């Protein structure tokens, strides 16, 4: 269960921490939020191997971009992801949400489903557990929310996704992307379950 949400001051990425091999939880404290640039992060869903391989290549491409042309746009990061996902669609099972903060463009969210298509959205949800919160998220999402409001929206949203989806669980990790910098938040079962 992964989501990225744009708010007034930037963007917030949210994810669960559960990795499954069948019905066995291989890792119950997984970090599904991965840095491709200082203020461009992504959420990974699908094959753990495929998404890591893609994320590792994109981080390389943007590092080399930065050396030559300076800080890349969130749109640019999304395009590199798309290029890998679209051209290798026959061999890849990767659903990636790209989220980043510019000063010019502020908070931006791009979702890349299996096909390798790109969609720019105010907020995005993906993963097995996302199906259970389409109704909730649509009813409860507003534009230009506060940081506290947006953290609550993601916490409540993933709380429900984790509750109903067996493949989702553990802790809720979040990454806040604003002008202020990069903040990592963690929320434990005892907190989010009683919501």
């Amino acid at each position: 269960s992964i989501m990225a949400v744009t708010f007034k001051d930037g963007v917030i990425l949210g994810a669960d921490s559960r990795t499954t091999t069948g019905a066995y939880i291989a890792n119950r404290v997984t970090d599904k939020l991965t840095r491709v640039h200082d203020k461009i992060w992504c959420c990974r869903s699908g094959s753990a191997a495929d998404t890591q391989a893609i994320a590792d290549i994109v981080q390389y491409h943007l590092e080399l971009y930065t050396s030559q042309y300076g800080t890349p746009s969130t749109e640019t990061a999304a395009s590199v992801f798309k290029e890998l996902c679209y051209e290798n669609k026959d061999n890849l099972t990767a659903g990636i949400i790209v989220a980043g903060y510019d000063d010019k463009n502020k908070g931006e969210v791009y979702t890349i489903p299996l096909g390798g298509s790109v969609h720019k959205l105010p907020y995005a949800i993906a993963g097995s557990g996302s199906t259970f919160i389409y109704g909730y998220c649509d009813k409860n999402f507003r534009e230009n929310m506060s940081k506290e409001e947006t953290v609550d929206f993601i916490k409540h949203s993933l709380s429900q996704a984790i509750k109903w989806d067996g493949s989702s669980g553990g802790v809720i990790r979040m990454v806040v992307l604003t002008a202020a910098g990069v903040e990592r938040l963690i929320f434990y079962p005892d907190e989010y379950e009683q919501l």
Binding site: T19, T20, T21, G46, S47, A48, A49, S168
Partner: peptide
């Protein structure tokens, strides 16, 4: 395999 490992696979949200």
């Amino acid at each position: 395999x490992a696979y949200x």
